[PDB]
Amino acid sequence: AKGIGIPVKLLHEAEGHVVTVELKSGEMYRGELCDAEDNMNCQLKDVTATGRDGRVTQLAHLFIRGSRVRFFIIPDMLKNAPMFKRIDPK
Amino acid sequence: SKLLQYINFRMRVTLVDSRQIVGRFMAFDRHMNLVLGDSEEFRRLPPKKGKSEEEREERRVLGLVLLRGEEIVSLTIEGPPPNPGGPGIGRAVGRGMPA
Amino acid sequence: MVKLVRFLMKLANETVQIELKNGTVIQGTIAGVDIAMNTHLKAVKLTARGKNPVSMDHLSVRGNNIRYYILPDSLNLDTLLVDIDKPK
Amino acid sequence: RPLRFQTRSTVKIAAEPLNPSELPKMVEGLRKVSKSYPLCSTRVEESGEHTIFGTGEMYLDCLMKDLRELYAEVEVKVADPVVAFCETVVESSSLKCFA
Amino acid sequence: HTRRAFDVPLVNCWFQEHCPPTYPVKVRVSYQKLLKNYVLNLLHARPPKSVKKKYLLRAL
Amino acid sequence: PELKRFMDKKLSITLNANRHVSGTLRGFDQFMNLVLDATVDEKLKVDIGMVVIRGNSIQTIEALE
Amino acid sequence: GQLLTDFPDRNYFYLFEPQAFVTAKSLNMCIPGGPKFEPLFRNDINKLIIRSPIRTEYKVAFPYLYNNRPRKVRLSVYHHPMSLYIKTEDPDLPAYYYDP
Amino acid sequence: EGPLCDEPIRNVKFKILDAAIAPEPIHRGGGQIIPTARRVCYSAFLMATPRLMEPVYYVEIQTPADCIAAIYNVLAKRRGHVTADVPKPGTPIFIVKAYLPVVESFGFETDLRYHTQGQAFCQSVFDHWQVVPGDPLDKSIVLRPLEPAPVQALAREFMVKTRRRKGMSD
Amino acid sequence: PIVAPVKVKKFETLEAEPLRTHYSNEFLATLMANPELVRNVAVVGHLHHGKTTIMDMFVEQTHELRKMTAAQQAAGKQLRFTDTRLDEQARAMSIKMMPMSLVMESHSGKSFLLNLLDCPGHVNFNDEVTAAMRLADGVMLVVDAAEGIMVVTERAVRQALQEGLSITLMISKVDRLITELKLPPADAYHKLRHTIEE
RNA sequence: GACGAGCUGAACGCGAAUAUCUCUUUCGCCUUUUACUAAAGAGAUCCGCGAGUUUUGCUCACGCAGUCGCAUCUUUUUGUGGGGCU
RNA sequence: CCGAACG
Ligand SMILES: Nc1nc2c(ncn2[C@@H]2O[C@H](COP(=O)(O)OP(=O)(O)OP(=O)(O)O)[C@@H](O)[C@H]2O)c(=O)[nH]1
Ligand SMILES: [Mg+2]
Ligand SMILES: [Mg+2]
């Protein structure tokens, strides 16, 4: 909406896909994001937890606080978002 | 911002924990969020004497990544961006002569 | 509108130094500072904690991880100090 | 499972191509009509003529239009429309009928 | 756009607001002929083709 | 917020300095304060009753179901 | 207005628009208050049923259903939606008003 | 098919009371009784007072009050049963429930617009079946070509012309 | 003819290249390959109650067709996108249902691909309807604010519940409350409420 | 990151107004030809019309100007610091 | 429907 920057609407249109979440603590979280917040709080499902020691754990759902999160890994499929193409020089 | 001059331009990022992220620029948010295409994590391992600092920084390939400004500390450039006819005629004519 | 980022955004083309939150040192020219205190510098050299200096044609630094600025000794402070009370 | 409409092709029309010399494409038209109109129904009798089954005024109207122009291009005479009559009981027969 | 005064028909509405049964025979016949030419000029206006003009009085 | 999809469900809530409290949700705020029923400290093995956790006191939450 | 006398709807001319008259001429059949047009070009009783007469507004309102050999026609009686506007008369009532 | 019109038989019960069957399978294949089953259907229904059935369009007519009477007038000419005239909440148009048979729907939307000057517009959907009045097998009425029969002779001449078209004798 | 003219076979004349849209080709290619961003919806209503025009407004907001609109209001007709066959056109009627999936926006900015199937609403075309309705798992019933419920609306509603569909109400043509009927805002609330209640 | 009325030129294009003509046929007037009728088609013409810079003719008018190379309490720019183990 | 020239 008016006021909102592009990459969070990127995050929103990433909905319904399987992505990865790195938080500032260093562990990795792979799962299907259900929906996310303006404040980057997000809910994934089918959760793979990769702990700081390589620990692999199975979590049904995850709600991740955004200001806890470092970055997101998102399919380049979705890097075809209309913002990406529209801004593009060609 | 002047980092509008910087979309599509390949760049490197430092995190607070000093981990390195190299990717190309797609979109930027006011919160210093960034969109990195073709991103890879270079994490500095401790330098074990007898080897170059340049030859064993652990590279992981992250793919497409997006960066929250809160832990974004420093950004630099890495490289460049990767890769009426008019009313004229000409006709053959002899030159006329007066005699 | 605070006084001081009001002062800092007029540091355009200032050849100054910066200390980072974790102890990195940066000497370079301020091409811009914005309302978030994020600075883009030109003609830069950045020297990390215990690290060799490396020069940068240009550099970006987040306003929040900035520890502080080292301003020029040649600074007409009282030039840039007027107008800070002026709302535009 | 096939489409279980709400509606039935309750109206029926007769179709006789003005030129019998083009009854193949006529039926091919009818055939291709049976291509685009889910409720279209083509039925041949002991009378041999092709009766066509539609909801009512507009459906048979536009099916006759597209039959005329879309598929066959053979102009066909259609008799007065008439609908399908079912056959029911009033009260049960008084004798048991054998065959 | 402005029209040419003779382009503007002034009795066209009389073909829309449809006949009341109070029409003497002559007026009904005349109304019918007018409404016929009406629906016909409406319908079959053959747009000819755009071959380009002369402008007699501009040239003169 | 999606915490609404969690109403009255047993949860595992991780907090600052590596702490886990597991209790059936009771309610939340815009500041993401959370009130829990029958919460258990997974470190010391203690069911700590009904609790409120602070917003920035929420690293993550998992749904055991 | 007194010359216009009153407004037309696209409504009223359901078999009085041009399309009525195209269907008229293409079938050699003409509206009762409708004009004449000379031809463009030039049935078993026991097996065919009449419970109501095929009228001319009938063949004129569905030209291809009710007519053998219809041609050169544009479309037929398609109706504009009903118009629920009635002339508010006196300028004193509110702009917006319930019609009795 | 059925015997009266070779059109679908509806609302009919076929109760098996007796079959005296030949004992061995070759005496009782399909080729022996499939005609016989159809013949017992023909006969058993034929003597059960057989009657004819119409489809009845569910006709809904939105109309102003100006045109209500002519609605009723033309459908009355076309034997349509008006069910009701519900004044629409919030508009000056009345929806009108009617049941007008599909036979009697021929050119109906037109004439309904024509004697209302078009302020009314009606819709018709297939609704149900019901029985054609009269005696459909009847002979006690010898009927008119080119003229419509009355209520008392419809079911008769209707299946009659049915047969005559479908290729059957009267 | 003795020399048969090589005719444009004027059946239904479409355009000669994929048009300009506010999204790409590969963007829709992306949004298709994952079920959680695709909604199948058939749009049904009575005769004329606004279905074709609503589909057209969707097209108008998500595509690039402005000079088309200028040609429309210069020629004196309003656009009908899904009414493509120039004979379904010249009767102001949808004759055969036509599909279209548009990449539309949410309030979240997440673009969803919505498969809307513009249907005929005239009763005798219910056949088209069921096809689209067995195609799409959801339905949008466009009931026109003015005239309320009609035949084809509730008959498609029975079609909608029989095939177990997500039925969604679109009160179209609300301006007929303001401009034709001139019902005040309060009586407009009553009439809208009564239509959804019906 | 920004400004037209009137004429003749533009070169491209047919909201609602429509008359005439030619041709190929049929039909009707009917002694013949013009001059006509009304049908089918195929072709023209007239009287007009819209937008782009071409300026001719203002009789209007301009340049520190409207615009330049989101501003401290749990969710964002006021970060949780410090140490140390392989 | 409906009138002019010519022969
Ligand atoms: N007053 C008003 N008229 C509208 C509105 N939307 C459409 N219309 C008109 O309603 C007419 C019929 O709507 P359509 O676009 O044909 O929609 P429809 O109901 O699918 O009609 P069918 O194609 O016959 O099924 C249009 O030609 C418009 O003039 C609206 O919002 N208000
Ligand atoms: Mg002579
Ligand atoms: Mg002589």
mmCIF file of C-alpha atoms in Angstrom, chain D residues 20-67:
data_model
loop_
_atom_site.group_PDB
_atom_site.id
_atom_site.type_symbol
_atom_site.label_atom_id
_atom_site.label_comp_id
_atom_site.label_asym_id
_atom_site.label_seq_id
_atom_site.Cartn_x
_atom_site.Cartn_y
_atom_site.Cartn_z
ATOM 1 C CA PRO D 20 -29.978 -32.241 -49.501
ATOM 2 C CA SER D 21 -26.793 -32.148 -51.593
ATOM 3 C CA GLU D 22 -25.192 -30.694 -48.451
ATOM 4 C CA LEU D 23 -26.734 -32.826 -45.691
ATOM 5 C CA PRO D 24 -23.271 -34.212 -44.745
ATOM 6 C CA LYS D 25 -21.854 -30.797 -43.862
ATOM 7 C CA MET D 26 -25.307 -29.987 -42.536
ATOM 8 C CA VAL D 27 -24.944 -32.793 -40.005
ATOM 9 C CA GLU D 28 -21.262 -31.905 -39.716
ATOM 10 C CA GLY D 29 -22.522 -28.441 -38.899
ATOM 11 C CA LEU D 30 -24.976 -30.084 -36.527
ATOM 12 C CA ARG D 31 -21.997 -32.223 -35.473
ATOM 13 C CA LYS D 32 -19.857 -29.144 -34.956
ATOM 14 C CA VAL D 33 -22.892 -27.595 -33.289
ATOM 15 C CA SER D 34 -22.794 -30.551 -30.945
ATOM 16 C CA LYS D 35 -19.247 -29.217 -30.484
ATOM 17 C CA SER D 36 -19.997 -25.869 -28.836
ATOM 18 C CA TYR D 37 -23.460 -26.119 -27.251
ATOM 19 C CA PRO D 38 -23.497 -28.373 -24.150
ATOM 20 C CA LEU D 39 -27.300 -28.559 -24.123
ATOM 21 C CA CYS D 40 -27.539 -29.044 -27.888
ATOM 22 C CA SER D 41 -28.995 -32.449 -28.649
ATOM 23 C CA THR D 42 -29.236 -33.967 -32.135
ATOM 24 C CA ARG D 43 -31.754 -36.770 -32.521
ATOM 25 C CA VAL D 44 -32.751 -38.749 -35.607
ATOM 26 C CA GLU D 45 -36.129 -40.429 -35.766
ATOM 27 C CA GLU D 46 -37.976 -43.124 -37.592
ATOM 28 C CA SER D 47 -38.873 -39.972 -39.555
ATOM 29 C CA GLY D 48 -35.168 -39.604 -40.331
ATOM 30 C CA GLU D 49 -35.113 -35.824 -39.840
ATOM 31 C CA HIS D 50 -32.690 -34.313 -37.327
ATOM 32 C CA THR D 51 -34.498 -32.767 -34.372
ATOM 33 C CA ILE D 52 -32.474 -30.404 -32.204
ATOM 34 C CA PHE D 53 -33.069 -29.834 -28.522
ATOM 35 C CA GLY D 54 -32.605 -26.528 -26.728
ATOM 36 C CA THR D 55 -33.795 -24.590 -23.713
ATOM 37 C CA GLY D 56 -35.972 -22.116 -25.564
ATOM 38 C CA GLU D 57 -36.118 -18.988 -27.637
ATOM 39 C CA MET D 58 -32.643 -17.468 -27.468
ATOM 40 C CA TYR D 59 -30.624 -20.674 -27.139
ATOM 41 C CA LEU D 60 -32.123 -22.235 -30.256
ATOM 42 C CA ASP D 61 -32.000 -18.798 -31.884
ATOM 43 C CA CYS D 62 -28.242 -18.403 -31.492
ATOM 44 C CA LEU D 63 -27.577 -22.062 -32.190
ATOM 45 C CA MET D 64 -29.461 -21.617 -35.477
ATOM 46 C CA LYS D 65 -27.392 -18.505 -36.151
ATOM 47 C CA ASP D 66 -24.072 -20.232 -35.509
ATOM 48 C CA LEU D 67 -25.226 -23.291 -37.440
#
